[PDB]
Curated annotation (Swiss-Prot):
UniProt-annotated location(s): Virion membrane; Host endoplasmic reticulum membrane
Protein's name in the database: Envelope protein E
Topology with respect to the bilayer: Multi-pass membrane protein
Protein source organism: West Nile virus
Highest taxon of the lineage: Viruses
């Protein structure tokens, strides 16, 4: 079964990979152990507005294990221009800027 959302922070591993299409692959490590849980990630315009503006290719992100420092790969399609890839929330939410040419 799958609980709710992952209550712990994730770390950015490597740099967001550009697929060539118009997406990016994220190499995420989870510091948590509460998983299975859902990854609170979304492609938003800016840090000030969490209103989703991009879309996931690997929809409904999952951290399927209950051991720490696991690892997840999640493909994402940001919006053209300047966007912020957000993972987590609160003093936990990590942040990464991206630019689509």
């Amino acid at each position: 079964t799958t609980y709710g959302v992952c209550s712990k922070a994730f770390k950015f591993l490597g740099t967001p990979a550009d697929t060539g299409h118009g997406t990016v692959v994220l190499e995420l490590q989870y510091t948590g152990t509460d998983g299975p849980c859902k990854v609170p990630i979304s492609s938003v315009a800016s840090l000030n507005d969490l209103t989703p503006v991009g879309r996931l290719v690997t929809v409904n992100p999952f951290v399927s294990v209950a051991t720490a420092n696991a690892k997840v790969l999640i493909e994402l399609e940001p919006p053209f221009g300047d966007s912020y890839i957000v993972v987590g929330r609160g003093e936990q939410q990590i942040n990464h800027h991206w630019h689509k040419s």
